[PDB]
């Protein structure tokens, strides 16, 4: 209890919010949830193999893609084992288990004490009953032309990551009145309260008060009787209360049915959220914690025709953004049992239920009992994600989604993780199938767990609307990850807290860069190192990598908007095969939550291309948003911007020259072996970024924001606020790019023919998952793009994907998007140089 009192304070500094401070609660839902998450936590902590949890092999069941077999000559792989400068390369079959590889080294090449293969310089192990081809690090080594180096050392002790012991009346609501301490608005106004009964973005019923003058205190004492009956209220229905003046000024919500299935009784004083200027924050059950500046509100509570089948199939086959008319919904419902045979159709089918009708909901639940086909069908994440978005508030409907997620291997959980955590924002209750799912998979696997921690912590630090809910989920996870990880997270938290201070301090001291600031960093960073900064820590975007000491020599305040710090660290693992530093950018000013979502979709796309045996060489570098307009950014080594390569020859301003990029490429490559591979890396990376950026609607960029490695890998950066008559481009395929591919004006070459053909395989590969990208894009805007003015913004994604327009016209459409880039030349790019200078 005295020892347990301190532990909670340790949990609190890890979490970033105190899950016991009950100043901002009007019921016990959070505590009920903190209490409810004890079973699933203990049930997973007790269920996980201690060894395989401790070493956490990162593996996959997916086939080794075509492009990685072609890299394997004569069906063998070259493992380079190490020990104490005793290297020895070994030929190994792709299907060889790691235990059966130590058998080749120890038992052959020259009771027992069992050891394991760790990757040199990394907390990454090659253990467990998996073929060597199926470990991702191995695949990573193949894809980038690297060589698999490993140390033969002892397993980590499973003891280190153990845990501490533990009526038919019409519904009515009385609006007493509203209360703001200071009415800021300049002129006099009038105001009314709007009370909506909502279920999953549908307003079932609506009342309004009479308008009264806008004063610091405004009382009504009016009963608002609704059309809906108490019997007819579905679990997860919200009382959404809103203040208007015609303009929405304030909102707050309250679950009419609580977490014990009780109707909500009694007096409530709800502190409300103010409105800037839809958005996941609109939907929160959380009240505003700021009890001194926030508007308050006070209330009190108490077989068919072919024509129709074809009409049904044409509806089931439409994208998720295609609306349903009244006519469509009545068909889906009337033929619900025929609709139940088509998983593709569940989202539209469940959007056709009248949730405000107790008898229909009953019929919907018996209908959910006969879901044999849904269960057997192969997991579609696109379809699954869709039943977990803002349009579905029924927990049983959502359960089926999370059910299908149970099938995911860790590797895939990692792809969709970021947006699964964000999807918790659409849960009506703090305790849900999804929140528990995230908890289990986090507890089951340290890699999932690592990123769960940071994704949750990301939101806890910058969302008043959802911090509490996520805090309960993070706490739950932290209480089962073990002492070791608690130790890593604490170390990592200390570092980023330590380094955020410097980032903000340095920013204050300069509105170009000064000599006094450059030494200020030198000194301040020289200080932190002395003894306060931990010895080493996990890099939060690459948890297998442990940063050690700072390379103060290499650190500087960057000469760019918002004065980010360019920091570099020596690796803390001596078995690392280099003295090459770990580069991190620390920035305040940009909303790096947006970058996270965008980079994670890029990773999603690379995975969609692996399915169709494509590899478009994206470099979605690490990004972790750690607070409000603040976070870190991985440094991709050996890279420079396209704008600066132009500026290295042409100069600080002028006409951009087409020859420069190809000279820069050739000037860096040492041979006709590398350069011509570098050119092949460019053709591919350029295509990928051209396609990905086009579909995401962020293809029109200043080439100061496009980069290239000294090996041909092209990649974009800085993705915040890019989603906002003037000239436009679909993507950046400028004449300098084409020059590398061997074309000029409206000409053509073999490398450009490969470009054109790569883009088309890419663009059609993404169109194969139209729905998936639509859901992920729609969710991204609601949960992470503030300034989400309209759903119209979402409809960009369907246009770009050319929904309902055959494979072949789609080949054409995208070929002509390229042709617009060839026509526009340097002009749009010339306008950005102007724009980023012509204030
Ligand atoms: C070209 S630079 O002068 O070195 N510079 C200026 C800004 C910047 C960024 C960056 C990334 N994201 C965001 N939001 N802001 C800046 N990111 C990066 N990198 C990120 C990828 O690795 C290469 C370096 N470099 C930046």
PDB file of C-alpha atoms in Angstrom, residues 212-453:
ATOM      1  CA  UNK A 212     -33.429  33.632 -24.731  1.00  0.00           C
ATOM      2  CA  UNK A 213     -30.977  36.525 -24.567  1.00  0.00           C
ATOM      3  CA  UNK A 214     -27.331  35.545 -24.234  1.00  0.00           C
ATOM      4  CA  UNK A 215     -26.211  36.338 -20.676  1.00  0.00           C
ATOM      5  CA  UNK A 216     -23.633  34.773 -18.338  1.00  0.00           C
ATOM      6  CA  UNK A 217     -26.525  32.780 -16.852  1.00  0.00           C
ATOM      7  CA  UNK A 218     -29.563  31.627 -18.875  1.00  0.00           C
ATOM      8  CA  UNK A 219     -32.325  29.521 -17.279  1.00  0.00           C
ATOM      9  CA  UNK A 220     -35.228  27.641 -18.945  1.00  0.00           C
ATOM     10  CA  UNK A 221     -36.533  25.032 -16.482  1.00  0.00           C
ATOM     11  CA  UNK A 222     -38.240  23.444 -19.550  1.00  0.00           C
ATOM     12  CA  UNK A 223     -39.010  19.753 -20.046  1.00  0.00           C
ATOM     13  CA  UNK A 224     -38.104  18.601 -23.569  1.00  0.00           C
ATOM     14  CA  UNK A 225     -40.272  15.611 -24.438  1.00  0.00           C
ATOM     15  CA  UNK A 226     -39.033  13.515 -27.364  1.00  0.00           C
ATOM     16  CA  UNK A 227     -40.958  11.271 -29.770  1.00  0.00           C
ATOM     17  CA  UNK A 228     -38.881   8.184 -28.879  1.00  0.00           C
ATOM     18  CA  UNK A 229     -39.942   5.906 -26.031  1.00  0.00           C
ATOM     19  CA  UNK A 230     -37.683   4.872 -23.151  1.00  0.00           C
ATOM     20  CA  UNK A 231     -38.190   1.274 -24.325  1.00  0.00           C
ATOM     21  CA  UNK A 232     -36.962   2.321 -27.777  1.00  0.00           C
ATOM     22  CA  UNK A 233     -33.595   3.743 -26.649  1.00  0.00           C
ATOM     23  CA  UNK A 234     -30.714   1.553 -27.889  1.00  0.00           C
ATOM     24  CA  UNK A 235     -27.617   0.941 -25.760  1.00  0.00           C
ATOM     25  CA  UNK A 236     -24.933   3.377 -26.860  1.00  0.00           C
ATOM     26  CA  UNK A 237     -27.408   6.151 -27.613  1.00  0.00           C
ATOM     27  CA  UNK A 238     -26.052   9.591 -26.676  1.00  0.00           C
ATOM     28  CA  UNK A 239     -27.830  12.639 -25.364  1.00  0.00           C
ATOM     29  CA  UNK A 240     -25.999  15.256 -27.436  1.00  0.00           C
ATOM     30  CA  UNK A 241     -26.597  18.766 -26.056  1.00  0.00           C
ATOM     31  CA  UNK A 242     -25.634  21.799 -28.171  1.00  0.00           C
ATOM     32  CA  UNK A 243     -25.719  25.592 -27.820  1.00  0.00           C
ATOM     33  CA  UNK A 244     -26.456  27.691 -30.903  1.00  0.00           C
ATOM     34  CA  UNK A 245     -26.670  31.405 -31.699  1.00  0.00           C
ATOM     35  CA  UNK A 246     -27.134  30.452 -36.787  1.00  0.00           C
ATOM     36  CA  UNK A 247     -23.975  28.937 -35.294  1.00  0.00           C
ATOM     37  CA  UNK A 248     -22.903  26.010 -33.086  1.00  0.00           C
ATOM     38  CA  UNK A 249     -20.946  27.336 -30.100  1.00  0.00           C
ATOM     39  CA  UNK A 250     -20.801  24.487 -27.572  1.00  0.00           C
ATOM     40  CA  UNK A 251     -21.459  20.750 -27.335  1.00  0.00           C
ATOM     41  CA  UNK A 252     -21.474  17.964 -24.772  1.00  0.00           C
ATOM     42  CA  UNK A 253     -22.697  14.381 -24.776  1.00  0.00           C
ATOM     43  CA  UNK A 254     -23.982  11.906 -22.214  1.00  0.00           C
ATOM     44  CA  UNK A 255     -24.669   8.199 -22.626  1.00  0.00           C
ATOM     45  CA  UNK A 256     -28.386   7.777 -21.937  1.00  0.00           C
ATOM     46  CA  UNK A 257     -27.792   4.109 -21.112  1.00  0.00           C
ATOM     47  CA  UNK A 258     -24.844   3.592 -18.766  1.00  0.00           C
ATOM     48  CA  UNK A 259     -22.207   0.836 -18.551  1.00  0.00           C
ATOM     49  CA  UNK A 260     -24.442  -1.352 -16.324  1.00  0.00           C
ATOM     50  CA  UNK A 261     -27.389  -1.070 -18.755  1.00  0.00           C
ATOM     51  CA  UNK A 262     -29.103   1.468 -16.454  1.00  0.00           C
ATOM     52  CA  UNK A 263     -31.056   4.441 -17.784  1.00  0.00           C
ATOM     53  CA  UNK A 264     -29.372   7.638 -16.672  1.00  0.00           C
ATOM     54  CA  UNK A 265     -31.069   9.268 -13.666  1.00  0.00           C
ATOM     55  CA  UNK A 266     -30.548  12.474 -11.712  1.00  0.00           C
ATOM     56  CA  UNK A 267     -29.017  15.934 -11.858  1.00  0.00           C
ATOM     57  CA  UNK A 268     -26.072  16.698 -14.139  1.00  0.00           C
ATOM     58  CA  UNK A 269     -23.882  19.766 -14.575  1.00  0.00           C
ATOM     59  CA  UNK A 270     -21.899  19.160 -17.769  1.00  0.00           C
ATOM     60  CA  UNK A 271     -18.950  21.303 -18.725  1.00  0.00           C
ATOM     61  CA  UNK A 272     -18.904  21.631 -22.471  1.00  0.00           C
ATOM     62  CA  UNK A 273     -16.462  21.729 -25.333  1.00  0.00           C
ATOM     63  CA  UNK A 274     -16.110  24.918 -27.307  1.00  0.00           C
ATOM     64  CA  UNK A 275     -15.971  24.904 -31.118  1.00  0.00           C
ATOM     65  CA  UNK A 276     -13.234  26.248 -33.408  1.00  0.00           C
ATOM     66  CA  UNK A 277     -14.512  28.032 -36.542  1.00  0.00           C
ATOM     67  CA  UNK A 278     -16.979  16.078 -38.884  1.00  0.00           C
ATOM     68  CA  UNK A 279     -14.519  15.250 -36.105  1.00  0.00           C
ATOM     69  CA  UNK A 280     -14.133  12.372 -33.622  1.00  0.00           C
ATOM     70  CA  UNK A 281     -13.951  14.858 -30.715  1.00  0.00           C
ATOM     71  CA  UNK A 282     -17.636  15.746 -31.320  1.00  0.00           C
ATOM     72  CA  UNK A 283     -18.558  12.248 -30.133  1.00  0.00           C
ATOM     73  CA  UNK A 284     -16.748  11.974 -26.761  1.00  0.00           C
ATOM     74  CA  UNK A 285     -18.529  11.026 -23.521  1.00  0.00           C
ATOM     75  CA  UNK A 286     -15.908  13.138 -21.742  1.00  0.00           C
ATOM     76  CA  UNK A 287     -16.797  16.467 -20.162  1.00  0.00           C
ATOM     77  CA  UNK A 288     -14.470  19.469 -20.337  1.00  0.00           C
ATOM     78  CA  UNK A 289     -11.964  19.422 -17.375  1.00  0.00           C
ATOM     79  CA  UNK A 290     -11.451  23.221 -17.498  1.00  0.00           C
ATOM     80  CA  UNK A 291     -14.162  23.993 -14.897  1.00  0.00           C
ATOM     81  CA  UNK A 292     -13.331  27.750 -14.790  1.00  0.00           C
ATOM     82  CA  UNK A 293     -13.562  28.926 -18.443  1.00  0.00           C
ATOM     83  CA  UNK A 294     -16.016  26.420 -19.932  1.00  0.00           C
ATOM     84  CA  UNK A 295     -19.677  26.913 -20.718  1.00  0.00           C
ATOM     85  CA  UNK A 296     -21.663  24.634 -18.441  1.00  0.00           C
ATOM     86  CA  UNK A 297     -25.134  23.098 -18.889  1.00  0.00           C
ATOM     87  CA  UNK A 298     -27.461  21.832 -16.182  1.00  0.00           C
ATOM     88  CA  UNK A 299     -30.168  19.248 -16.698  1.00  0.00           C
ATOM     89  CA  UNK A 300     -32.310  16.632 -14.921  1.00  0.00           C
ATOM     90  CA  UNK A 301     -33.407  13.120 -15.874  1.00  0.00           C
ATOM     91  CA  UNK A 302     -36.653  11.553 -14.548  1.00  0.00           C
ATOM     92  CA  UNK A 303     -36.190 -15.731 -53.026  1.00  0.00           C
ATOM     93  CA  UNK A 304     -36.849 -12.525 -54.956  1.00  0.00           C
ATOM     94  CA  UNK A 305     -37.425 -10.997 -58.429  1.00  0.00           C
ATOM     95  CA  UNK A 306     -34.232 -10.899 -60.473  1.00  0.00           C
ATOM     96  CA  UNK A 307     -34.833  -7.155 -60.931  1.00  0.00           C
ATOM     97  CA  UNK A 308     -34.601  -6.623 -57.149  1.00  0.00           C
ATOM     98  CA  UNK A 309     -31.725  -9.030 -56.580  1.00  0.00           C
ATOM     99  CA  UNK A 310     -29.849  -7.096 -59.249  1.00  0.00           C
ATOM    100  CA  UNK A 311     -30.974  -3.908 -57.479  1.00  0.00           C
ATOM    101  CA  UNK A 312     -29.678  -5.351 -54.197  1.00  0.00           C
ATOM    102  CA  UNK A 313     -26.361  -6.509 -55.692  1.00  0.00           C
ATOM    103  CA  UNK A 314     -25.775  -3.106 -57.357  1.00  0.00           C
ATOM    104  CA  UNK A 315     -26.124  -1.528 -53.882  1.00  0.00           C
ATOM    105  CA  UNK A 316     -23.920  -4.008 -52.062  1.00  0.00           C
ATOM    106  CA  UNK A 317     -21.236  -3.335 -54.724  1.00  0.00           C
ATOM    107  CA  UNK A 318     -21.011   0.461 -54.190  1.00  0.00           C
ATOM    108  CA  UNK A 319     -18.130   2.112 -52.279  1.00  0.00           C
ATOM    109  CA  UNK A 320     -18.524   3.095 -48.595  1.00  0.00           C
ATOM    110  CA  UNK A 321     -18.953   6.822 -49.404  1.00  0.00           C
ATOM    111  CA  UNK A 322     -21.903   6.122 -51.710  1.00  0.00           C
ATOM    112  CA  UNK A 323     -24.953   7.072 -49.633  1.00  0.00           C
ATOM    113  CA  UNK A 324     -28.003   4.913 -49.068  1.00  0.00           C
ATOM    114  CA  UNK A 325     -31.397   6.314 -50.000  1.00  0.00           C
ATOM    115  CA  UNK A 326     -34.531   5.453 -48.060  1.00  0.00           C
ATOM    116  CA  UNK A 327     -35.344   3.041 -50.896  1.00  0.00           C
ATOM    117  CA  UNK A 328     -31.971   1.281 -50.640  1.00  0.00           C
ATOM    118  CA  UNK A 329     -32.282   0.772 -46.859  1.00  0.00           C
ATOM    119  CA  UNK A 330     -35.772  -0.740 -46.954  1.00  0.00           C
ATOM    120  CA  UNK A 331     -34.573  -3.300 -49.537  1.00  0.00           C
ATOM    121  CA  UNK A 332     -31.452  -4.239 -47.526  1.00  0.00           C
ATOM    122  CA  UNK A 333     -33.614  -4.695 -44.448  1.00  0.00           C
ATOM    123  CA  UNK A 334     -36.545  -6.524 -46.007  1.00  0.00           C
ATOM    124  CA  UNK A 335     -34.065  -8.927 -47.658  1.00  0.00           C
ATOM    125  CA  UNK A 336     -31.781  -8.916 -44.599  1.00  0.00           C
ATOM    126  CA  UNK A 337     -31.248 -12.714 -44.709  1.00  0.00           C
ATOM    127  CA  UNK A 338     -30.105 -12.567 -48.335  1.00  0.00           C
ATOM    128  CA  UNK A 339     -28.002  -9.556 -47.377  1.00  0.00           C
ATOM    129  CA  UNK A 340     -26.475 -11.644 -44.547  1.00  0.00           C
ATOM    130  CA  UNK A 341     -24.839 -14.024 -47.074  1.00  0.00           C
ATOM    131  CA  UNK A 342     -22.608 -11.203 -48.368  1.00  0.00           C
ATOM    132  CA  UNK A 343     -19.964  -9.929 -45.909  1.00  0.00           C
ATOM    133  CA  UNK A 344     -19.235  -6.989 -48.252  1.00  0.00           C
ATOM    134  CA  UNK A 345     -22.812  -5.907 -47.416  1.00  0.00           C
ATOM    135  CA  UNK A 346     -22.778  -5.846 -43.610  1.00  0.00           C
ATOM    136  CA  UNK A 347     -21.904  -2.125 -43.238  1.00  0.00           C
ATOM    137  CA  UNK A 348     -24.747  -1.059 -45.525  1.00  0.00           C
ATOM    138  CA  UNK A 349     -27.089  -3.614 -43.990  1.00  0.00           C
ATOM    139  CA  UNK A 350     -26.455  -2.428 -40.439  1.00  0.00           C
ATOM    140  CA  UNK A 351     -26.741   1.211 -41.609  1.00  0.00           C
ATOM    141  CA  UNK A 352     -30.285   0.265 -42.673  1.00  0.00           C
ATOM    142  CA  UNK A 353     -31.522  -0.741 -39.243  1.00  0.00           C
ATOM    143  CA  UNK A 354     -33.729   1.683 -37.353  1.00  0.00           C
ATOM    144  CA  UNK A 355     -31.808   1.580 -34.087  1.00  0.00           C
ATOM    145  CA  UNK A 356     -34.385   3.856 -32.431  1.00  0.00           C
ATOM    146  CA  UNK A 357     -36.877   0.969 -32.493  1.00  0.00           C
ATOM    147  CA  UNK A 358     -36.469  -1.734 -29.813  1.00  0.00           C
ATOM    148  CA  UNK A 359     -38.306  -4.377 -31.869  1.00  0.00           C
ATOM    149  CA  UNK A 360     -36.064  -3.938 -34.938  1.00  0.00           C
ATOM    150  CA  UNK A 361     -32.904  -4.070 -32.807  1.00  0.00           C
ATOM    151  CA  UNK A 362     -34.205  -7.397 -31.515  1.00  0.00           C
ATOM    152  CA  UNK A 363     -34.593  -8.639 -35.103  1.00  0.00           C
ATOM    153  CA  UNK A 364     -31.086  -7.330 -35.809  1.00  0.00           C
ATOM    154  CA  UNK A 365     -29.689  -9.422 -32.915  1.00  0.00           C
ATOM    155  CA  UNK A 366     -31.376 -12.681 -33.943  1.00  0.00           C
ATOM    156  CA  UNK A 367     -30.022 -11.816 -37.396  1.00  0.00           C
ATOM    157  CA  UNK A 368     -26.548 -11.506 -35.814  1.00  0.00           C
ATOM    158  CA  UNK A 369     -27.042 -15.000 -34.359  1.00  0.00           C
ATOM    159  CA  UNK A 370     -27.256 -16.516 -37.881  1.00  0.00           C
ATOM    160  CA  UNK A 371     -23.871 -15.105 -39.032  1.00  0.00           C
ATOM    161  CA  UNK A 372     -22.264 -18.421 -40.039  1.00  0.00           C
ATOM    162  CA  UNK A 373     -21.067 -16.900 -43.366  1.00  0.00           C
ATOM    163  CA  UNK A 374     -19.424 -13.831 -41.818  1.00  0.00           C
ATOM    164  CA  UNK A 375     -17.445 -16.079 -39.415  1.00  0.00           C
ATOM    165  CA  UNK A 376     -16.169 -18.476 -42.096  1.00  0.00           C
ATOM    166  CA  UNK A 377     -15.267 -15.802 -44.674  1.00  0.00           C
ATOM    167  CA  UNK A 378     -11.665 -14.617 -44.965  1.00  0.00           C
ATOM    168  CA  UNK A 379     -10.754 -11.499 -42.968  1.00  0.00           C
ATOM    169  CA  UNK A 380     -11.176  -8.277 -44.912  1.00  0.00           C
ATOM    170  CA  UNK A 381      -9.666  -5.455 -42.872  1.00  0.00           C
ATOM    171  CA  UNK A 382     -11.331  -2.827 -45.077  1.00  0.00           C
ATOM    172  CA  UNK A 383     -14.758  -4.263 -44.289  1.00  0.00           C
ATOM    173  CA  UNK A 384     -13.776  -4.860 -40.666  1.00  0.00           C
ATOM    174  CA  UNK A 385     -12.492  -1.311 -40.173  1.00  0.00           C
ATOM    175  CA  UNK A 386     -15.756  -0.032 -41.657  1.00  0.00           C
ATOM    176  CA  UNK A 387     -17.909  -1.587 -38.910  1.00  0.00           C
ATOM    177  CA  UNK A 388     -15.654   0.111 -36.300  1.00  0.00           C
ATOM    178  CA  UNK A 389     -15.990   3.675 -37.655  1.00  0.00           C
ATOM    179  CA  UNK A 390     -18.247   6.479 -36.459  1.00  0.00           C
ATOM    180  CA  UNK A 391     -21.362   5.107 -38.199  1.00  0.00           C
ATOM    181  CA  UNK A 392     -21.786   2.070 -35.906  1.00  0.00           C
ATOM    182  CA  UNK A 393     -22.537   2.488 -32.235  1.00  0.00           C
ATOM    183  CA  UNK A 394     -24.016  -0.931 -31.492  1.00  0.00           C
ATOM    184  CA  UNK A 395     -21.522  -3.046 -29.561  1.00  0.00           C
ATOM    185  CA  UNK A 396     -22.731  -6.388 -30.935  1.00  0.00           C
ATOM    186  CA  UNK A 397     -22.304  -5.155 -34.511  1.00  0.00           C
ATOM    187  CA  UNK A 398     -18.844  -3.912 -33.579  1.00  0.00           C
ATOM    188  CA  UNK A 399     -18.026  -7.169 -31.752  1.00  0.00           C
ATOM    189  CA  UNK A 400     -18.172  -9.017 -35.011  1.00  0.00           C
ATOM    190  CA  UNK A 401     -15.536  -6.659 -36.436  1.00  0.00           C
ATOM    191  CA  UNK A 402     -13.149  -7.155 -33.524  1.00  0.00           C
ATOM    192  CA  UNK A 403     -13.929 -10.853 -33.797  1.00  0.00           C
ATOM    193  CA  UNK A 404     -12.467 -10.834 -37.291  1.00  0.00           C
ATOM    194  CA  UNK A 405      -9.397  -8.926 -36.088  1.00  0.00           C
ATOM    195  CA  UNK A 406      -8.629 -11.856 -33.736  1.00  0.00           C
ATOM    196  CA  UNK A 407      -7.324 -13.723 -36.795  1.00  0.00           C
ATOM    197  CA  UNK A 408      -4.546 -11.198 -37.444  1.00  0.00           C
ATOM    198  CA  UNK A 409      -0.938 -12.259 -36.906  1.00  0.00           C
ATOM    199  CA  UNK A 410       1.234  -9.668 -35.134  1.00  0.00           C
ATOM    200  CA  UNK A 411       2.835  -8.410 -38.356  1.00  0.00           C
ATOM    201  CA  UNK A 412      -0.560  -7.249 -39.631  1.00  0.00           C
ATOM    202  CA  UNK A 413      -1.718  -5.968 -36.238  1.00  0.00           C
ATOM    203  CA  UNK A 414       1.369  -3.715 -36.506  1.00  0.00           C
ATOM    204  CA  UNK A 415       0.234  -2.370 -39.905  1.00  0.00           C
ATOM    205  CA  UNK A 416      -3.236  -1.373 -38.716  1.00  0.00           C
ATOM    206  CA  UNK A 417      -2.349  -0.591 -35.131  1.00  0.00           C
ATOM    207  CA  UNK A 418      -2.223   3.194 -35.323  1.00  0.00           C
ATOM    208  CA  UNK A 419      -5.753   3.365 -36.751  1.00  0.00           C
ATOM    209  CA  UNK A 420      -7.130   0.648 -34.471  1.00  0.00           C
ATOM    210  CA  UNK A 421      -6.041   2.795 -31.471  1.00  0.00           C
ATOM    211  CA  UNK A 422      -7.585   5.854 -33.153  1.00  0.00           C
ATOM    212  CA  UNK A 423     -10.756   3.822 -33.758  1.00  0.00           C
ATOM    213  CA  UNK A 424     -11.244   3.620 -29.981  1.00  0.00           C
ATOM    214  CA  UNK A 425     -12.418   7.207 -30.298  1.00  0.00           C
ATOM    215  CA  UNK A 426     -15.567   5.864 -32.046  1.00  0.00           C
ATOM    216  CA  UNK A 427     -16.365   3.444 -29.219  1.00  0.00           C
ATOM    217  CA  UNK A 428     -19.402   4.607 -27.233  1.00  0.00           C
ATOM    218  CA  UNK A 429     -18.012   3.085 -23.963  1.00  0.00           C
ATOM    219  CA  UNK A 430     -14.575   3.247 -22.329  1.00  0.00           C
ATOM    220  CA  UNK A 431     -14.598  -0.551 -22.047  1.00  0.00           C
ATOM    221  CA  UNK A 432     -15.047  -2.388 -25.360  1.00  0.00           C
ATOM    222  CA  UNK A 433     -14.075  -5.423 -27.425  1.00  0.00           C
ATOM    223  CA  UNK A 434     -11.608  -3.265 -29.342  1.00  0.00           C
ATOM    224  CA  UNK A 435      -9.937  -1.661 -26.347  1.00  0.00           C
ATOM    225  CA  UNK A 436      -9.521  -5.126 -24.813  1.00  0.00           C
ATOM    226  CA  UNK A 437      -8.262  -6.508 -28.120  1.00  0.00           C
ATOM    227  CA  UNK A 438      -5.616  -3.793 -28.257  1.00  0.00           C
ATOM    228  CA  UNK A 439      -4.690  -4.620 -24.641  1.00  0.00           C
ATOM    229  CA  UNK A 440      -4.271  -8.355 -25.265  1.00  0.00           C
ATOM    230  CA  UNK A 441      -2.122  -7.997 -28.380  1.00  0.00           C
ATOM    231  CA  UNK A 442      -0.012  -5.365 -26.627  1.00  0.00           C
ATOM    232  CA  UNK A 443       0.517  -7.686 -23.672  1.00  0.00           C
ATOM    233  CA  UNK A 444       1.108 -10.671 -25.956  1.00  0.00           C
ATOM    234  CA  UNK A 445       3.942  -9.094 -28.010  1.00  0.00           C
ATOM    235  CA  UNK A 446       6.539  -6.540 -26.923  1.00  0.00           C
ATOM    236  CA  UNK A 447       6.700  -4.855 -30.344  1.00  0.00           C
ATOM    237  CA  UNK A 448       2.965  -4.289 -30.528  1.00  0.00           C
ATOM    238  CA  UNK A 449       3.169  -3.275 -26.847  1.00  0.00           C
ATOM    239  CA  UNK A 450       5.933  -0.718 -27.528  1.00  0.00           C
ATOM    240  CA  UNK A 451       3.984   1.074 -30.231  1.00  0.00           C
ATOM    241  CA  UNK A 452       0.699   0.793 -28.316  1.00  0.00           C
ATOM    242  CA  UNK A 453       2.373   2.656 -25.461  1.00  0.00           C
TER     243      UNK A 453
END
